[PDB]
Amino acid sequence: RFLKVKNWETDVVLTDTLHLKSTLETGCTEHICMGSIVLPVRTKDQLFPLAKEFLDQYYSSIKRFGSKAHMDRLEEVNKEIESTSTYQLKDTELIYGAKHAWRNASRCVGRIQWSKLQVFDARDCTTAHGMFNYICNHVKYATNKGNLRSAITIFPQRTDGKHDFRVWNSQLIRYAGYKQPDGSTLGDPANVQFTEICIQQGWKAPRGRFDVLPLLLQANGNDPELFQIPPELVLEVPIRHPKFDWFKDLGLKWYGLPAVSNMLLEIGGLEFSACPFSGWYMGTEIGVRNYCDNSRYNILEEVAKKMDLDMRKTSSLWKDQALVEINIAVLYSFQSDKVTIVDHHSATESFIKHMENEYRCRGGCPADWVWIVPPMSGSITPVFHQEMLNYRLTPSFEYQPDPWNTHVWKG
């Protein structure tokens, strides 16, 4: 079966066949679409087909499907599963797997870059101190003095589910949030709960607006431990505006390296519960979401006020005007300090090119429109009018519960 998507701006029609290789579930049924819902120990038995499906894909990609080396590897994995209940990936399979999880990441507009991922294999890691060292190296390598490079660091896989490696931080680098007695928040409200955990664990909180959180690292199912990322490794950019001289006096800065550390990487049935990965920012992630969400730094009012906009009626589009100026400021600051950043026009244009190429060469490109369309100016970017098909290919990145809800403490 073939599925058609249409672009309503250009009338270009593409044909998807890759959806036939789809696996997991969307949450949707013929009766209900869950397209806008944010989130809607394995047996030997369920594991070998998963392994096989993965290794069949791996060996096709290297043009060795059905080769002696292919069968030998299937047999080797099969026996290892039977006698040990799990199996180890070759380095080459791991690299390929992490790259494909990104390639398959339907919410990611940045996928044109998928093949250039630097994979750091941390499967020899055994302690939280080991994790900390691996994470510092990742940070330094990815940052590259502002010339950012994609990377992922992969810690040992789940075994019985009692010995998990986890990074408790949702991102490697993020700012503390502190709820005050008066009900206000200092710093980033997204991180209040995790900040409190850190404090409870012994972190001495500076209690400022932009305090870099410490890492909270769990190795081998042990209790997690606190570590400070060396400050010289944390690249940050003061935010200023090219024409508004008062913008700098807002006191804003952001970190250059977005590094997601709470997701789970699934390859060939194996579960990597600590697999921090990083790229670089699209400007609206900072300018629209991090600054302008009401549940975040919430700076729209303060900026529009300084701009002396008419704020008595929403219909002046004062919020829209301020939003734009803030995003201009974020891009200007990054570019001036020579830190890699991408504007939403540029990122979406790239993504459409990526997507068309994927249809030709791969037979599809699963994509979640709700996430792909940028959070401002949606319609004047080339993704808005692009029909997309969302489905789940493995290898993949998945959500997992926050470890503070599931962890068994030892003391």
Ligand X SMILES: Cc1cc(N)nc(CCc2cc(N)cc(CCc3cc(C)cc(N)n3)c2)c1
- Could you tell me which residues are annotated as the binding site for heme b? 108, 399
* Contact flag: residue 355 with ligand HEM (CB under 6 A): no
- CA–CA separation, 177 vs 208, rounded Å? 9
Counting contacts by CB under 5 A, is residue 253 touching Cl ion?
A: no
358, 332 in Cβ contact below 8 A? no
Tokens linked to 248 = 């700098």
| Ranges within 301-320 binding a copy of itself (CB under 8 A) | 314-317, 319-320
278 binds ligand X (CB under 6 A): yes
Asked whether position 184 contacts a copy of itself by CB under 8 A, the answer is no
Q: Which of 189, 214, 269, 279 binds ligand HEM (CB under 6 A)?
A: 279
> Of 254 and 280, which has the nearer Cβ to ligand X?
280
Number of residues that bind Cl ion (CB under 5 A): 1
Distance of CA 144 to the CA centre of its chain: 19
Give binding residues as ranges: 36, 108, 171, 280-281, 285, 370-371, 384, 399
Whole-angstrom distance, CA of residue 39 vs CA of residue 61: 31
Using CA atoms, how far apart are residues 165 and 133, in angstroms rounded to an integer?
Answer: 14
Three-state DSSP state, 246: coil
Q: Which residue has the tokens 């459409």?
A: 352
Please say whether the beta carbons of 58 and 91 come within 8 A.
no
Q: DSSP secondary-structure letter at 287?
A: I
* Residue 194 neighbours by CB under 8 Å, 6+ apart: 168, 169, 170, 213, 216
Q: Is 107 in the site for Cl ion (CB under 5 A)?
A: no
Tokens of 245: 């001289």
How many amino acids of this chain bind a copy of itself (CB under 8 A)? 66
Phi, psi angles (nearest 5°) of residue 115: -75, -5
Nearer residue to ligand X within complex by CB, 96 or 102: 102
Decide: residue 184, CB within 10 A, 0-12 exposed, 13-18 middle, 19+ buried. Answer: exposed
What does each C-alpha distance from 35 to 26, 57, 177, 331, 374 come to in angstroms?
8, 28, 31, 31, 16
- Measured at the CA of 212, the angle between CA 209 and CA 213, to 5 degrees, comes to 110
Q: Which stretch binds Zn ion (CB under 5 A): 11-19, 20-28, 66-74, 165-173?
A: 20-28
Give the tokens for residue 7.
């672009």
Strand pairing report for 270-272 and 341-342: unpaired
CA distance 121 to 94: 8
Answer whether 134's CB lies under 8 Å from 125's CB.
yes
Active site residue 301: no
For ligand HEM, the closer of residues 17 and 115 by Cβ is 115
What is the x/- site pattern for a copy of itself, positions 370-409, by CB under 8 A? x--xxxxxxxx---xx-xxxxx------------------
Q: Which does 280 bind (CB under 5 to 8 A by kind): a copy of itself, ligand HEM, Cl ion, none?
A: ligand HEM
109: contact with ligand HEM by CB under 6 A? yes
Give catalytic status of residue 280 as yes or no.
yes
CB of 381 to Cl ion, least distance (A): 12
Q: Which stretch binds ligand X (CB under 6 A): 124-132, 159-167, 277-285, 306-314?
A: 277-285
**Known catalytic residue at 285:** yes
SS3 164: coil
CB of 259 vs ligand X, minimal distance in Å: 7
What residues contact 305, with CB distance under 8 A and at least 6 apart? 311
Residue 370 binding result from ligand X, ligand HEM, Zn ion, none, given CB thresholds of 5 to 8 Å by partner type: ligand X
Catalytic residue, from 93, 225, 266, 285: name it: 285
Q: Of 158 and 174, which CB lies nearer to Zn ion in the complex structure?
A: 174
Binding test (CB under 8 A) with a copy of itself, winner from 12, 13, 17, 25:
25
Q: Which residues bind a copy of itself (CB under 8 A)?
A: 3, 5-6, 8-10, 19, 22, 25-38, 283-284, 288-289, 292-295, 300, 314-317, 319-321, 323-324, 327-328, 331, 335, 343, 345-346, 349, 368-370, 373-380, 384-385, 387-391
Which residues are part of the catalytic machinery? 108, 111, 280, 285
Q: Which residues bind ligand HEM (CB under 6 A)?
A: 102, 105, 107-110, 113, 117, 150, 152, 277, 279-280, 282, 285, 342, 347, 371, 375, 397
